[PDB]
Amino acid sequence: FRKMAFPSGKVEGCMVQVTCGTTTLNGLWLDDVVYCPRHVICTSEDMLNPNYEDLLIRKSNHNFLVQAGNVQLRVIGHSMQNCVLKLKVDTANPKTPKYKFVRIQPGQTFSVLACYNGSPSGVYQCAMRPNFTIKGSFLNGSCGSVGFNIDYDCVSFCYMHHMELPTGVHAGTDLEGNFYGPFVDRQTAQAAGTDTTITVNVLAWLYAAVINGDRWFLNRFTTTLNDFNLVAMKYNYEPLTQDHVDILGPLSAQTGIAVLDMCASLKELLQNGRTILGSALLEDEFTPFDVVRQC
Amino acid sequence: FRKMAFPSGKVEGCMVQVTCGTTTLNGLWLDDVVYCPRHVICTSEDMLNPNYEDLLIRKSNHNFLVQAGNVQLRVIGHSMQNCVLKLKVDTANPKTPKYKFVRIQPGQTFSVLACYNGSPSGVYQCAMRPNFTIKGSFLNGSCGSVGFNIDYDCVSFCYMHHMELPTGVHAGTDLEGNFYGPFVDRQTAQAAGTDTTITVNVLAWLYAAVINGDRWFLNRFTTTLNDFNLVAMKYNYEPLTQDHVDILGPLSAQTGIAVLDMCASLKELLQNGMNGRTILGSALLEDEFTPFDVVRQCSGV
Ligand SMILES: *C(=O)[C@H](C[C@@H]1CCNC1=O)NC(=O)[C@H](CC(C)C)NC(=O)OC[C@@H]1C[C@H]1c1ccccc1
Ligand SMILES: *C(=O)[C@H](C[C@@H]1CCNC1=O)NC(=O)[C@H](CC(C)C)NC(=O)OC[C@@H]1C[C@H]1c1ccccc1
């Protein structure tokens, strides 16, 4: 059992290089539109507190250089939607997949195709935290990298990268330019809330382990929802609902471990602390969906 | 800092489905050849101890169903090379990347494109353990999935998946059909040796942590290759050579922390544990990043 990204070929086809002044970053070319963070129009000074409306007024279509390999695309329109720029280009991406824009929920996962200069460097899987940050690997030039899931041949884009916070975690927008969490695209110190642990994911992981041999944490003891949720309240785990139980229903079936048998194992691991799938810590960034896909 | 696979696009376009009998697995289609594990030609009873020569003799081209997307590729020939089967096909993959076949060294890493029925489902990063196994995620039907690196525009194919060992680790071959390690493609309990921890990679990871702000484990001490190696041997860490030191040179230069200083820090961590702290978020020492891995990621190649 491994943390696993989606095959990223479908997204690589959409990545382009967008340049404006001395600023360059990555764009998402879908049909005849390139999506990219709006702070591409910003200079050094401007970054501390830009007026994007006024700054955009100062830029014409020709100030934007969209590059797809050894091919320049002509920009012919531009519009600001929230924190993203939509540049209309004269050419439609032949490699446009079937795609949709979604806004995922915290606790959901997606893959990230980290890019630089419109070229992909690597791929990894992230979770959206309850405080609407992600733990990534992004350097300067990586803005415009996107997060996505693949259901069938449909690419669901859900994230576009804009910034690092002083803690070193990351923040960005959906593809309509709306930030996840309270953040603004300005170079100021910004706090994320206190985080918490995605209980439903820890359970699915404990299922993943069982399915893959690790079984030492199981026990004869059992527990109720209301009982488990006092323990969880104390260790800063999200409370478990009947909706979460039902979500875990399918892994319960494959294993014959009732959800609340597994919650008993988790109460005990929480109160008393070997390894589980070779981790010394409880992993909370696999969803039930992820666990079922990989088993 | 993250465990990060190469982008897999160039490889997805080479994955096909190969079926022979009730047995389906994945093949790698490059130019006009499809490469896959040879046990695709086995049934149930054959698995326990097959004579692959005899079994391949009794099979013909029409016995191999190769599907690529929604297109059926006509097989027009079949040879065996070591533990892999080469199926010549009527059409050449128009999506054949520039590629090479390499046999990687233990301690080196590579990306795995996990596939089922010729369809990619996922991608992750692995190391060739010193005992020539890999800790992967492989189910039935995943055989023929490949591991690879990208250097330049060239895909270097280094691994093709064959089997799971009793302990749960995985074993396979290079793309010429030679297994990494002492393993055979037969349904029998098979031992890998005792595994060791890849010391030069652990050091590479400690550099990655310093680069990313995690510094509590640095100390003012230093050591010698010889004095460190006597500790390494005790905790089943590969011994460090002057070659490993020079490989770590570039990361030494960027952090201005001397290799043997970091070895002093590793020494302390092994003898004292992590005292409850973490490092790059981990409660254990990671050994599946090469120095090359850390540099590619901490500089954006
Ligand atoms: C993409 O253009 C880039 C990616 C950043 C680069 C460093 N790591 C990353 O993920 N984005 C930016 O540089 C941001 C542009 C603004 C928001 C329009 N700015 C940014 O990320 O600044 C880094 C964090 C804010 C600074 C900070 C730390 C500690 C105390 C105060 C401020
Ligand atoms: C790919 O077709 C498949 C992938 C395996 C299946 C389960 N997990 C995997 O990675 N390969 C095979 O099934 C192998 C074909 C043989 C070599 C002809 N066989 C295999 O993987 O056996 C599973 C483990 C070895 C058996 C075992 C355990 C304990 C004691 C004795 C034997």
Q: Which tokens belong to B298?
A: 């901490």
Q: Which parts of B110-224 fold into alpha helices (H)?
A: 199-211
| Amino acid found at B201 | N
CA dihedral A238, A214, A208, B174 (to 10 degrees): 140
The total number of residues shown for chain A amounts to 295
- Burial profile B191-219: b = 16 or more Cβ within 10 angstroms, e = fewer: ebeebbbbbbbbbbbbbbbbbeebeebbe
Helix (H, G, I), strand (E, B) or coil at A19: strand
Q: Which CATH class is domain A199-294?
A: mainly alpha
CA–CA dist A45, B260 (Å, integer):
42
Label the pairing between strands B154-164 and B99-101.
Answer: parallel
Residue B293: alpha-carbon gap to chain centroid: 13
Measured CA to CA in angstroms, residue B156 lies from B71, B102, B147, B153 at distances of 26, 6, 9, 10
Best B4, B153, B155, B288 member to test A by mutation, with max A CBs in 10 Å, is B4
- State the ligand closest to the CA atom of A52: 1
Q: Which of A20, A115, A143, A158 is catalytic?
A: A143
CA–CA dist B69, B88 (Å, integer):
18
**What is the Rg, in whole angstroms, of the alpha carbon atoms belonging to chain B?**
22
Q: How many angstroms separate the CA of residue A293 from the nearest CA in chain B?
A: 8
Measured CA to CA in angstroms, residue B180 lies from B48, B86, B151, B162, B201 at distances of 21, 19, 22, 11, 20
CA–CA dist A148, B4 (Å, integer):
16
Question: Contacts of residue A278 in chain B, CB cutoff 8 Å?
Answer: 135
- ∠ CA(B77), CA(B81), CA(B84), 5° rounding? 85
CA–CA dist B263, A268 (Å, integer):
37
Q: What is the DSSP letter of B134?
A: B
CATH of B199-298, picked from 3.40.50.720, 3.20.20.140, 1.10.10.10, 1.10.1840.10, is 1.10.1840.10
Helix (H, G, I), strand (E, B) or coil at A293: helix
CA–CA dist A23, A73 (Å, integer):
18
Helix (H, G, I), strand (E, B) or coil at A255: helix
CA–CA dist A282, A270 (Å, integer):
9
Which residue from B3, B282, B300 is facing A3, i.e. has the nearest CB? B3
| Cβ pairs bridging A and B (under 8 Å) | 98
Query: Is B53 within 8 Å of B122 (Cβ atoms)?
Result: no
Residue B39 annotated to the active site: yes
- Name the residue among B145, B175, B176 with its Cα closest to residue B161: B145
Query: Is B18 within 8 Å of B118 (Cβ atoms)?
Result: yes
Residues with CB under 6 A from ligand 2: B 25, 39, 42, 47, 138-140, 142-143, 162-164, 166, 170, 185-189
Q: Would you list which residues of chain A are within 8 Å, Cβ to Cβ, of chain B? A: 1-10, 12-13, 113-114, 116, 120-124, 135-137, 139, 141-142, 168, 212-213, 275, 278-281, 293-295
Query: Is B113 within 8 Å of B11 (Cβ atoms)?
Result: yes
* Placement of tokens 């399915």 in the chain: A211
Residue A42 annotated to the active site: no
Q: How many angstroms separate the CA of residue B210 from the nearest CA in chain A?
A: 13
Give residues with Cβ within 8 angstroms of B61, minimum separation 6. Answer: B75, B76, B77, B78
CA–CA dist B281, B283 (Å, integer):
7
Helix (H, G, I), strand (E, B) or coil at B171: strand
* Placement of tokens 């603004």 in the chain: A184
Residue B114: alpha-carbon gap to chain centroid: 12
Q: Which of A36, A39, A126, A158 is catalytic?
A: A39
Half-sphere exposure of A248 (CA within 13 A, CB side): 27
Contact A9 B13 (CB under 8 A): yes
